[PDB]
Amino acid sequence: MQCKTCSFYTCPNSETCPDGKNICVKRSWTAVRGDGPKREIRRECAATCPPSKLGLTVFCCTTDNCNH
């Protein structure tokens, strides 16, 4: 599989995903901690997505680098 999972909000580069998983994933939530951005759209590779319960905005993708 291949699913880019950067920390910024615009990583068009490519990033294959290891492990026996197979997908792209992202979760976004607003939260003012220090000086970061607003909606933290963290990302990662998995079967469908992280263990989010959808309370967080999950965004997965069944294809090569998708969720930038």
Side-chain angles (χ1 to χ4, degrees):
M1 52 279 181
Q2 293 176 221
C3 291
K4 147 72 55 169
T5 73
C6 70
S7 303
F8 239 92
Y9 4 117
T10 149
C11 32
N13 273 353
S14 333
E15 214 206 72
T16 294
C17 296
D19 251 284
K21 47 162 130 288
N22 250 287
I23 243 180
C24 332
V25 322
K26 172 220 87 190
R27 324 92 114 203
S28 81
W29 60 99
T30 191
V32 56
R33 302 174 186 249
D35 221 26
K38 239 103 218 202
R39 256 131 135 70
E40 318 300 297
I41 40 49
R42 197 68 66 172
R43 265 130 193 175
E44 239 249 289
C45 310
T48 8
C49 252
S52 318
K53 204 110 264 256
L54 234 325
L56 217 63
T57 301
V58 215
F59 166 33
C60 335
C61 260
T62 43
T63 169
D64 72 72
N65 0 272
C66 173
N67 322 337
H68 315 273

